[PDB]
Design a protein around this ligand. Structure first.
Ligand code: ZN
Lengths: 365, 148, 781, 64
């Protein structure tokens, strides 16, 4: 590493080299945090986490008990040991608390003054973070499994919602229009994710073992349907062209948005060319998941090699996205891990699981 | 020097005694203090015993584990490395993996491991936050009655 | 909010790109040299180079290539900036007036994307149908040229290979054909595509992928008579044309990797190749009646460590260097009796990577003097800089200098240096450490291909001769150096922080702080202290030694027994790389937490974290301007000033100033090169620029700001790049406008405009008042 | 009396399965969807409705 510092000082290597190499080294040295703790307030398992995209300071967490906790991740104390204190809380005494489990919570991109939370109580609530009051509510005829706002859209502000209905809802936060729907799936839509690269590209994964990419501006259904075999087993499109041999319960675009990682209940993760949905045949081995709802997993950013952190039983499996090589198992949870969210500023990880714990993984040394 | 250690551990555990016979336990203490890899060899012996199907044998193995825990620090790091499996094998938390017979020895194992875990939370909890996680998980998620 | 004035004392001198062609006139042979922000246009005369223009781009020139579209009388220049400002420029001379008109311009920054490891690549189709940019992994941006744009509209073609090493356009292909080397887990392969502008997509290349050398790192597009390409790797040179597969493995190129090339002949019968060790080779293509017969490589000789090189004519080669002085060398037909055909005609000074620098009032005048550790392995040297224009001496060390400190009592400089030995070990050249008057080696009881040997050079501060050269332990890297007297004894010591570097580990676990005293022309080891990590930085702190072992900033006291005793530690750092001091306060520059205002409370005897900045800036240098202003340099070429704000929120340092310098600042230092503004902080950069930061007053800063906006409205940039965008604080995960910083170069450009333009600037006091103000601003450097 | 119950946590109908371990006098109710689990003592007169009852009661008590 002194070689890295010397090369940076002497201009031999771009500082990009040291930055991404050290980010990768930090991610590889991920371990149970020696001096850090997260305050425990959820009475039930944490189903979702979200660190705000700008300044990466505050973290939302939705629990199976319906409460939403807002934590400050910064060590505002002077000690090396600190607990991520809870700033705010939609608790059981809040007038607008979710009646059932909160399954997805997401900070509004471009601004930390608002966030959103969808629950199995058939509601997508939009909260003002300052007053901590519901600015809006969208009701659905069937329970919400996931939702996502575009991390890129300066123009549109649509929330793509996947419920147990076979339709992907698009709720306009600009003047409230939840009527827009996308047809083409056949069972519950367990995951939805906007492309970080393209403004109007949305990937939706449903229990019909299919993943569809939509240009929501378009009037002609999905753009691409992901196919495991790319055409080896080709059939007229009524039941073929499946992404997995089970329910596809998780989506994640890579950092650049040029590839898509789909995890399904066939104990398989697959990497897809996001421009034509071709399977890249990256192996990843066996990725154990049996979740009946959406599975939240994230990818690394700002590193020499991209990593993907997938909940794997009661562990976090870290894989290399483009080679599939298994990095490691982060092993500190006592029950199945529901979500993991990656802090890209310091290569940190926060994992929420059914054991009512949010565990922080920090690079060692 | 592994033969005598496997032996001594075997007579300690297979005997099924209510209480640890003192002088051979002292021999175990000395010869476990001798080397660190051989202390961890004793740890593997304990782990292999703890999976085996008899409540008295699991009780003997757990009491040896408690002796080394209160007596050794690298043992504390090594056991907190897999405290999850340690709790699965001691407390019988998972319904799919309950404790073998007899019922009396299993009950004594439950009481002894609850109280030992209480003592470990009081004495080494701050140095091992994973022990704190395990204690908290037992006290709320599994609702283990520590007052029993 | 803070008020800062940044001005370039010395313009950047390191050449990061050089291209030749007919830019100024159809008959002129121009040499365009890209120093970091400066584009220098020379005309290649029969002797030397005649400078015809020097323009200052609002951008770091990452790409610079000349191309002649069909029907164009003379070459157009394509420049891409590090912030992805693309511009096509034309040279228009109207008598005395010279103008670089922006024929086209645009910004090609993708909103998201992983910037490629091997860096920005820019190529132009040999028939000038398009510009191909590799800016991000997995993408290949294309700017069509047949569609004559004035906005440089571009489109991305998805490239299935995500780790592309190098790419070129092939010659003699009916369609734009790219040949590129890429890395996949199976190895490195060279593949070809044919780009289609109509279908906006790749098509199957003329010849299929071929598995190339593991370190195949360079692609050279051979001209039409041969066609195909040449791939240069670490160990072999191969030539592919689709069915011709020539290969050589010259043993003479094995010792160092080839990093640059240039085509000597228009038909590519000869190429120049520079290595990192400075060796210059000629690669010859032997033709047979045309196809290619056989490849030969012959060592022409040795030059400066060449970032780039360009054959001008008549055996003259411009060797543009980033690590040393640029050269204009002659390729003789016959050897010089030492096996070398290269002869240096001219040397252009280059303050290389300014890793460290000290301001000294040598000769006991009132004038400062910068002594800078410039350059690198073979081009390492000391540069002494004064105001006389700036006069620059050079003291070649022939080894990389790393740190420098002045010991006034001993009348010498302590310079940390590093040389490469190949084998026990053998020096590759006679370096300044080996040419000392006297020498010594450390015999320490604490610890018991090519390697770096680190030395402490005691250099006489009159003659700049190496009075002494103390070699350190085997596999020991000296990182920090400070000249100070500790405790209460009167002796002044050279205190050196070191680290034990072995290949088996990523972070040093061992190191020591060695206290030397230089007296009677000898360097006696006064004291040692085994520490448990690399001592990245040390500073004298109120008579004590404040050191930074890997993540711990700790304080040592100098006892009556002349030994170092720990007094206090602070551990809340990732790695404390940079340490500064003013009073009881310490400023800890961290690798990625970016600052920490620490305070040593003497009434108790420990540190206290007064404040911190929680933004994740990766640091290169740090300094303390005032009691409550803290300057810091981020590795993304930005300056930022943090301020102690005015509860726990008081522990948050507020970034009150932001600025994009465009340079990698390596060192700050209080001082000035001269005999209205408060303070003076000189800084040294990687591309050789020396700059100067001063604090301004509020009203004056506001007035200056106003002038900056007016000049931006008046002065026209070369690439039509907005100055605010150029100076906007930029990082891969952040982008903000410049605040709290005045661009001194832009203000000082107020002199170089005609009076009507001044009146345009000063539409809403008189112009003469502002001329006086800018003159006074120029006085400080 | 139905044996499959709506989960109080995820509101998924008939997603809760009840296991009566009579040998240990314990009833375990688990939701298949959200994987929430609850354990209560049971008697020989107990039924899955009683286990789901104890679960609802424990939820309401813990949520006070
Ligand atoms: Zn449920």
């Amino acid at each position: 590493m002194l070689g890295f510092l010397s090369a940076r000082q002497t201009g031999l290597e771009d500082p990009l080299r040291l930055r991404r190499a050290e980010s990768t080294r930090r991610v590889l040295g991920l371990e149970l945090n020696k001096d850090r703790d997260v305050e425990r307030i959820h009475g039930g398992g944490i189903n979702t986490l979200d660190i705000e995209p700008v300044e990466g300071r505050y973290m939302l967490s939705g629990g199976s008990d319906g409460v939403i906790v807002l934590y400050d991740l910064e060590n505002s104390s002077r000690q090396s040991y600190y607990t991520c204190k809870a700033v705010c809380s939609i608790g059981r005494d809040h007038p607008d608390v979710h009646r059932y489990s909160v399954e997805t919570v997401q900070w509004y991109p471009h601004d930390t003054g608002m966030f959103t939370s969808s629950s199995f109580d058939k509601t997508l609530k939009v909260w003002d973070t300052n007053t901590l009051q519901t600015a809006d509510v969208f009701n659905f005829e069937e329970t919400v499994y996931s939702h996502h706002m575009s991390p890129v859209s300066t123009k549109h502000c649509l929330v793509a919602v996947g419920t147990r209905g076979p339709k992907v809802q698009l709720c306009d936060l600009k003047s409230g229009s939840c009527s827009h729907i996308l047809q083409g799936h056949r069972q519950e839509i367990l995951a939805v994710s906007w492309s970080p690269r393209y403004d109007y590209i949305l990937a939706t994964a449903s229990a019909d073992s299919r993943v569809k990419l939509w240009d929501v501006r378009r009037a002609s259904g999905c753009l691409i349907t992901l196919d495991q075999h790319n055409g080896k087993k080709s059939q007229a499109v009524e039941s073929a062209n499946t992404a997995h041999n089970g329910k596809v319960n998780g989506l994640c675009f890579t950092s650049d948005g040029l590839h898509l990682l789909t995890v399904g209940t066939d104990n398989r993760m697959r990497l897809w060319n996001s421009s034509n949905g071709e399977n890249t045949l990256v192996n990843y081995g066996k990725v154990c998941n049996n979740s009946k709802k959406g599975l939240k997993f994230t990818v690394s950013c700002g590193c020499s090699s991209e990593f993907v952190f997938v909940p794997y039983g009661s562990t976090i499996a870290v894989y290399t996205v483009y080679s599939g090589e298994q990095i490691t198992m982060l092993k500190g949870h006592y029950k199945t891990v529901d979500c993991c969210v990656f802090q890209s500023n310091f290569q940190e990880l926060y994992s929420g699981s059914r054991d009512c714990n949010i565990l922080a993984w920090v690079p060692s040394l | 020097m592994d033969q005598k250690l496997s032996k001594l551990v075997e007579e300690l555990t297979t005997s099924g005694e209510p209480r640890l016979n003192p002088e051979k336990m002292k021999e175990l203490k000395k010869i476990c203090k001798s080397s660190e890899e051989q202390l961890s060899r004793a740890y593997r012996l304990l782990i292999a015993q703890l999976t085996q199907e008899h409540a008295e044998i699991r009780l003997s193995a757990f009491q040896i584990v408690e002796e080394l825990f209160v007596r050794s620090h690298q043992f504390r790091m090594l056991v907190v490395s897999n405290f999850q499996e340690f709790l699965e094998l001691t407390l019988g938390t998972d319904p799919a993996q309950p404790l073998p017979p007899p019922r009396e020895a299993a009950q004594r194992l439950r009481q002894a491991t609850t109280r030992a875990v209480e003592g470990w939370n009081e004495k080494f909890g701050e140095a091992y936050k994973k022990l704190a996680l395990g204690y908290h998980f037992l006290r709320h998620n599994k609702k283990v009655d520590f007052q029993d | 909010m803070s008020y800062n004035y940044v001005v370039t004392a010395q313009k950047p001198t390191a050449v990061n790109g050089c291209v030749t062609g007919h830019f100024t006139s159809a008959e002129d042979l121009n040499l365009l040299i890209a120093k970091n922000t400066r584009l220098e246009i020379y005309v290649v005369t029969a002797e030397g180079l005649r400078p015809v223009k020097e323009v200052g781009m609002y951008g770091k020139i990452a790409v610079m290539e000349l191309f002649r579209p069909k029907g164009e009388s003379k070459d157009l220049l394509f420049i891409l900036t590090a912030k992805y400002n693309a511009c096509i420029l034309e040279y228009k001379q109207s008598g005395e007036s010279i103008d670089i008109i922006t024929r086209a311009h645009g910004n090609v920054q993708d909103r998201i994307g992983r910037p490629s490891e091997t860096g920005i690549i820019g190529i132009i189709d040999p028939e000038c149908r398009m510009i191909g940019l590799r800016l991000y992994d997995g993408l290949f941006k294309v700017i069509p040229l047949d569609r004559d744009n004035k906005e440089l509209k571009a489109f991305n073609i998805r490239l299935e290979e995500l780790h592309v090493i190098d790419v070129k356009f092939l010659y003699g292909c009916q369609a734009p054909t790219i040949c590129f080397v890429y890395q996949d887990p199976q190895g490195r392969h060279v593949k070809t595509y044919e780009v289609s502008l109509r279908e906006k997509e790749f098509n199957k290349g003329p010849w299929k992928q071929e598995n190339v050398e593991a370190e195949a790192s360079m692609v050279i597009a051979v001209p039409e008579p041969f066609g195909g390409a040449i791939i240069i790797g670490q160990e072999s040179i191969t030539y592919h044309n689709g069915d011709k597969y020539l290969a050589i493995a010259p043993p003479i190129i094995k010792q160092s990797t080839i990093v640059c090339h240039n085509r000597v002949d228009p038909n590519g019968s000869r190429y120049l190749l520079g290595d990192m060790e400075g060796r210059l080779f000629m690669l010859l293509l032997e033709k047979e009646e045309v196809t290619l017969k056989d490849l030969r490589v012959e060592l022409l000789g040795e030059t400066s460590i060449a970032e780039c090189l360009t054959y001008l004519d008549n055996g003259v080669v411009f060797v543009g260097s980033r690590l040393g002085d640029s050269q204009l060398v002659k390729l003789n037909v016959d050897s010089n009796e030492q096996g070398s055909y290269v002869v240096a005609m001219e040397t252009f000074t280059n303050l290389g990577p300014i890793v460290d620098m000290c301001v000294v009032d040598l000769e006991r005048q009132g004038q400062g003097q910068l002594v800078t550790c410039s350059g690198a392995f073979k081009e390492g040297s000391l540069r002494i800089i004064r105001n006389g224009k700036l006069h620059i001496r050079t003291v070649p060390l022939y080894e990389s200098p790393r740190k420098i400190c002045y010991q006034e009592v001993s009348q010498c400089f302590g310079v940390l240096s590093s040389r490469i030995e190949v084998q026990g070990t053998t020096a590759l050249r006679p370096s300044a450490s080996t040419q000392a008057l006297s020498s010594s080696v450390s015999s320490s009881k604490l610890f018991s291909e090519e390697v770096e040997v680190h030395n402490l050079l005691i250099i006489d501060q009159h003659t700049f001769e190496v009075l002494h050269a103390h070699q350190f332990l085997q596999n020991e890297y000296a990182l920090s150096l400070v000249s100070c007297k500790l405790g209460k004894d009167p002796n002044t010591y050279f205190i050196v922080g070191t680290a034990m570097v072995y290949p088996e580990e990523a972070e040093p676990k061992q190191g020591r702080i060695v206290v030397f005293q230089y007296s009677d022309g000898k360097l006696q080891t006064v004291a040692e202290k085994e520490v448990k990590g690399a001592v990245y930085s040390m500073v004298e702190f109120n008579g004590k030694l404040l050191a930074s072992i890997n993540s711990t900033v700790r304080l040592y006291e100098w006892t009556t027994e002349k030994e170092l005793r720990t007094e206090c530690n602070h551990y809340n750092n990732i790695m404390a790389l940079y340490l500064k001091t003013k009073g009881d306060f310490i400023l800890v520059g961290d690798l990625m937490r970016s600052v920490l205002l620490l305070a040593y409370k003497p009434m108790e005897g420990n540190f206290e974290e007064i404040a911190r900045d929680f933004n994740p800036n990766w640091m290169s240098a740090v300094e303390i301007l005032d009691d409550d202003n803290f300057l810091g340099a981020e590795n993304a070429f930005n300056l930022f000033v943090c301020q102690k704000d005015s509860d726990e929120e008081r522990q948050h340092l507020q970034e009150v100033g932001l600025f994009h310098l465009g340079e990698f600042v390596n060192v700050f230092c209080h001082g000035s090169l001269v005999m209205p503004t408060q303070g003076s902080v000189l800084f040294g950069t990687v591309n050789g620029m020396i700059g100067l930061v001063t604090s301004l007053s509020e009203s004056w800063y506001n007035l200056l700001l106003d002038m900056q906006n007016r000049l931006n409205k008046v002065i026209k940039s070369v690439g039509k790049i907005e100055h605010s965008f150029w100076r906007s604080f930029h990082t891969e995960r952040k982008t903000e406008p410049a605040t709290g910083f005045i661009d001194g170069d832009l203000i000082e450009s107020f002199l170089d405009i005609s009076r009507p333009k001044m009146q345009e600037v000063v539409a809403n006091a008189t112009a003469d008042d502002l001329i006086k103000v800018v003159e006074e601003l120029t006085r400080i450097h | 009396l139905e044996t499959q119950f709506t989960c109080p946590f995820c509101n998924h109908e008939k997603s809760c399965d009840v296991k009566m371990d009579r040998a240990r006098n314990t009833g375990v109710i688990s939701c298949t969807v959200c994987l929430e689990e609850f354990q209560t003592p049971i008697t020989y007169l107990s039924e899955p409705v009683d286990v789901y009852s104890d679960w609802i009661d424990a939820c309401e008590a813990a949520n006070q």
